[PDB]
Design an enzyme around this catalytic site. Sequence first.
Site: not given
Ligand SMILES: NS(=O)(=O)c1ccc(C(=O)NCc2cccc(F)c2F)cc1
Ligand SMILES: [Zn+2]
Length: 258
Positions: A62, A92, A94, A104, A117, A196-197
């Site tokens: 992603h 990371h 976007h 975003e 982010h 956001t994902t």
């Molecule tokens: N774009 S953003 O900053 O909003 C964003 C930040 C972190 C995550 C994340 O940690 N995902 C995996 C995840 C999520 C929930 C629980 C989990 F165990 C896991 F691995 C996803 C999006």
């Molecule tokens: Zn993000």
Amino acid sequence: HHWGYGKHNGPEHWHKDFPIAKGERQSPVDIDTHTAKYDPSLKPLSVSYDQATSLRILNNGHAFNVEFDDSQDKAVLKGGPLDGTYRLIQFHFHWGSLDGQGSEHTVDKKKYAAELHLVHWNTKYGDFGKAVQQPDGLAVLGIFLKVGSAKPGLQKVVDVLDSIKTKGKSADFTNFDPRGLLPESLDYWTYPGSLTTPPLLECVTWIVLKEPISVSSEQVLKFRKLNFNGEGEPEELMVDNWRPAQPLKNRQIKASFK
Ligand SMILES: NS(=O)(=O)c1ccc(C(=O)NCc2cccc(F)c2F)cc1
Ligand SMILES: [Zn+2]
Ligand SMILES: [Hg+2]
């Protein structure tokens, strides 16, 4: 099928498996600078990244994440609208297929080339997993990237992208100093939101910096050469991995400056 950013599994389809997609505090949002409320009670941000320990960089299908050792208070975010200490776990970006899109969050409908982010979790909860079960479990520091001059501190990240071209690939990435990705000013906007994902959990206190950092056209170009697909599968360029702005609903965006 599994979520993505394509025509058949993109943001407009996420609600089917993650109903919270149509929730009350979804991110990102458009930041209307004239409706944002200057809050004099907001403390300055305290970014203490001197003891940061980066471990590796990974293409997760992603985006690419740079992970940090969060077993102790090594790199933390305090102050601002936060109560308590938040540990940096990963960062990371976007980005878009063209320079005019990619962020975003937007500012007065203006889209930037990319958005960084920096993800942090509230230490009082013990582990990242518990933090995502709380309304104030996470704090994400958002930084806009505009195309202009090169950002020296981002180069080490750009140089390693070749080794993690496809989904699942990872590379050791130690001694990276995240302070090289910060703008001069720490003025910000803040509002309660979500990841956001998917799973789109509403556990985030968003802190979006006012001042964008500039990166070169060549630097952003390197992001666009990554793949969503795993090795051996048909090639799909990792571009436009951003979620469009969501309804602000019953939320107010507060500014730390006037
Ligand atoms: N774009 S953003 O900053 O909003 C964003 C930040 C972190 C995550 C994340 O940690 N995902 C995996 C995840 C999520 C929930 C629980 C989990 F165990 C896991 F691995 C996803 C999006
Ligand atoms: Zn993000
Ligand atoms: Hg939550």
